[PDB]
Design a protein around this nucleic acid. Sequence first.
DNA 1: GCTACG
DNA 2: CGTAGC
Length: 5
Amino acid sequence: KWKSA
DNA sequence: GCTACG
DNA sequence: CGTAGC
């Protein structure tokens, strides 16, 4: 799930 | 697609 | 992917 904090 | 977010 | 801005 892509990329985040 | 690289960037930047998300 | 997925939308946006280039």
